[PDB]
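Input for the complex:
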Amino acid sequence: TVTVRTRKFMTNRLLQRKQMIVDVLHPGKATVPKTEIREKLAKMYKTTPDVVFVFGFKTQFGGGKTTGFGMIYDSLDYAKKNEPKYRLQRHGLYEKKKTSRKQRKERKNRMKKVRGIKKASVGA
Amino acid sequence: PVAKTWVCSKTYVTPRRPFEKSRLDQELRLIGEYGLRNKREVWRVKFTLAKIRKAARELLTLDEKDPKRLFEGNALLRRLVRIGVLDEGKMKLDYILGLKVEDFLERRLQTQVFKLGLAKSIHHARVLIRQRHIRVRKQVVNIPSFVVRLDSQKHIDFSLRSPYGGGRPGRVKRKNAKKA
Amino acid sequence: SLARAGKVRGQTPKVDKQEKKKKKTGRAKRRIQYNRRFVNVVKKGPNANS
Amino acid sequence: GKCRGLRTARKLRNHRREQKWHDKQYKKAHLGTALKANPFGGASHAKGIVLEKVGVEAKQPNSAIRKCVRVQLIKNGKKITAFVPNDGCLNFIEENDEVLVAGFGRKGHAVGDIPGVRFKVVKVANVSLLALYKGKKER
RNA sequence: UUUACUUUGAAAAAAUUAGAGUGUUCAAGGCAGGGCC
RNA sequence: UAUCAACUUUCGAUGGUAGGUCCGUCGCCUACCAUGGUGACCACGGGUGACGGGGAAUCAGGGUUCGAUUCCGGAGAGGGAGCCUGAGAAACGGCUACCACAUCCAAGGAAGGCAGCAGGCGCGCAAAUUACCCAUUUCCGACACGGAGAGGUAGUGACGAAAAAUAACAAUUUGGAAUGAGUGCAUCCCAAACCCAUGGGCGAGGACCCAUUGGAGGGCAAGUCUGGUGCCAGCAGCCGCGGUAAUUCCAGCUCCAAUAGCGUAUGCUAACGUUGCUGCAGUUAAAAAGCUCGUAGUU
RNA sequence: UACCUGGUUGAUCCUGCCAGUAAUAUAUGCUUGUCUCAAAGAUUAAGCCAUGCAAGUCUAAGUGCACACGAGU
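Predicted:
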């Protein structure tokens, strides 16, 4: 049933990646999560399930085949550097700050009106 | 400065005479013959034909030894014979002017499924596609206004998930079964 | 004057409309008009009572 | 006859330029007149306050009191006569209220047996007059 | 003696339009993808 | 636009000499000299609901109209004027004044420019959320890290455009059969959310989960139908309909281009060969100056 | 689609305009179940504005005794 094929495939070695168009079929499924895809993709290239990253998967009308982009890295520690911050956030780690962006703006303009080390107490 | 398109064209043209007694029946006849929703679809296919006729008309005004007429003319012919509105033997721009509105109505998906017997009537052929049954090369189509090509004419069949094809039945079939 | 506004609409009895069946719409309405005008054949107007 | 000469592009252009002014529909749209005298000032609709309810008599050979209203515009303070289109809708007109008047068919021309009324009221009290005639938007 | 006139090429922004190419399920559109590990 | 015909200089208007000035040329400015420069081929002056263009709408061709509007270029930041700094600003989300307007004062003073993004008032016929985030797109700096209402996303949205329901297959009314819209979970999507789209599940027989909008005298597709209202009320873009058998109005039924759109108002285009270059007219319908001379222009 | 139709008269042929017709774009009327796109305070007032934001910026590398945390961010 569900299987990946990786129609196209190229190795770049710039980011130490193996770029490929990962195409996964779904005869009776609804775009299985990438967790199931990353596990089945690591055993295909004998890599680890922590270095493969896939994105851009939208199931076409009716269902049956979902195409997307995929890439593999060398290690998880090396993947922490060459990876967008939101793609690492989608995993169980890297919970970014979620306070606000407007509260930080008004804090910056308030601290801009105070000169010296007293601005740290004004914002707090 | 927005990352958008703002490119959109119309598909139909309202006729000049709103109550032309001779025109009202000629378009109404195409309604029931091919199972169309309203007169907008008649004017839509009439507008696509009017564009192809005018595109072929301006090419015929140029000299035959003009490379623009040779390239653009053949490209228009190959697309007409590709969808099946024109035969390979009559592959010339002079035959484009002889194409009628029903020539493009026959290539409609709701009519091709009627010629193949997959549907009972021409009006049921619309509902057959409207309920996501007919597929073309494992690609299911829902809108009835699809146009098939010759390399995809012999691939019109039921979907692998439709009750009329091979797969699970409908929700009404499972409803009467559990209650009985 | 202006003392007769709404005369014929006030002198008209409040004859209510009759509840009729659901009229077909969309392709079904054009389908009925097709077979009724071309297929179902029997000069006369489509609404000429008498 | 017309000058056909190859260097007569200026003579032909200036002649047609000055002869277009002899066209009534062109001269009214390309001069200061017919735009400042127009109460709407080039607008399709206009709001106004109902000043009076006057019934103008139709012209011969007709005989019927056309129900209109003397309305003063808000945009420029001009006083016009908007015609109450439907039957009995003059009773729906309130006194000293806002009405959205528009043109009456022919542009700047009296329509029908009405002598000089060239405006009609569309909305009354921030609601359509057509709804007041069909038992909708009770106000 | 040199002009007007016609033809050819570079120039005569992109977008838009005309318009080759591509089944965004079709179309308006987009400049992108059918199939062999 | 001539109901603007002459115009520009007793403060440069045109040209000459020298110099000043600026990054640099120059009446840019100064001084001495010449009386020039432009103009019926429309200068000058005035008007513009004039930012220019790429383009848009409509068009057989020729055209007409539109272009504030996301691209390019210019202009401006309440009106002007004058500057600082900097490579680059006569900058206004930087200053210095005056003018207009306006805020806090303890009445001494101080501080103001949303034709930036949201929002408010006013103006009106006329036009959205004080919404979410630097991920895309990129830009700025000491920069992999930090910043961006530029931008991206969502809400409102019948500007407008592309797809597309309100049945269908049967019976002579009853059987199932096929499917979302809607309604509830995962996943996908997304920087997060959201519309989808998908996987099953919950989901229509007056399948009430029901389509209206102008019409039905002619132009112009559709009723001398039904009843009362009787030159009254009204209808009618036009011609015209009512003065007791109204096919027009005041209502039902029915019917008709319709159609998720459809009427109305106004601008504009075709219609319009009723602006005629293509392509109109001037004996009598609007019209060849009473007649001739005559330059420019045209041939 | 290189298109016209009603109206001067007892009737007719014309000139001729009005009206009819179809897109277009603003407003508005009634209506509005789904999806994908998408204009949106330009028109009168470049009228006037409450609040908030829109340019700041730190790398191994110009200068580094806040001990807040412990040479180093």
